[PDB]
From Swiss-Prot:
Organism, scientific name: Geobacillus kaustophilus (strain HTA426)
Gene: tilS
Family: Belongs to the tRNA(Ile)-lysidine synthase family.
Subcellular location(s) of the protein: Cytoplasm
Function: Ligates lysine onto the cytidine present at position 34 of the AUA codon-specific tRNA(Ile) that contains the anticodon CAU, in an ATP-dependent manner. Cytidine is converted to lysidine, thus changing the amino acid specificity of the tRNA from methionine to isoleucine.
Name recorded for this polypeptide: tRNA(Ile)-lysidine synthase
Source species, domain of life: Bacteria
Domain remark from Swiss-Prot or TrEMBL: The N-terminal region contains the highly conserved SGGXDS motif, predicted to be a P-loop motif involved in ATP binding.
Phylogenetic placement of the source organism: Bacteria, Bacillati, Bacillota, Bacilli, Bacillales
Amino acid sequence: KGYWFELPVPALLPLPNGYAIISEFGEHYPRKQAGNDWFVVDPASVSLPLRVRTRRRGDRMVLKGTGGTKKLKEIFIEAKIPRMERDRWPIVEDADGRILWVPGLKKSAFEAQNRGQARYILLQYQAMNS
Ligand SMILES: [Cl-]
Ligand SMILES: [Cl-]
Ligand SMILES: [Cl-]
Ligand SMILES: [Cl-]
């Protein structure tokens, strides 16, 4: 039940788990309240293209601030995610394999800060329900 996508931008990318990832370019840094279902990337500071793929064992990501490095498995357990939905859960990495974001669950230190960059990549994670 595994998958792997190169993530174009702009794009709306339906996923085998019933969710979609939407990408687009934006000039401005987001103002919305912090949440795990959106993400901001600075193209200049991360290796493109982005990919979205399912988990492998050993997968770890570096948390914001002094959070430290955290194994993805631990994140799924703490979130009480059913074993079947984790095997199917999108993981957003850069072209180098750095895990940037686990949509809906956790952000890495690699999320853009508001630093006067000319342009950002904006990501959104949303269900195909209603
Ligand atoms: Cl906004
Ligand atoms: Cl808001
Ligand atoms: Cl958090
Ligand atoms: Cl940044």
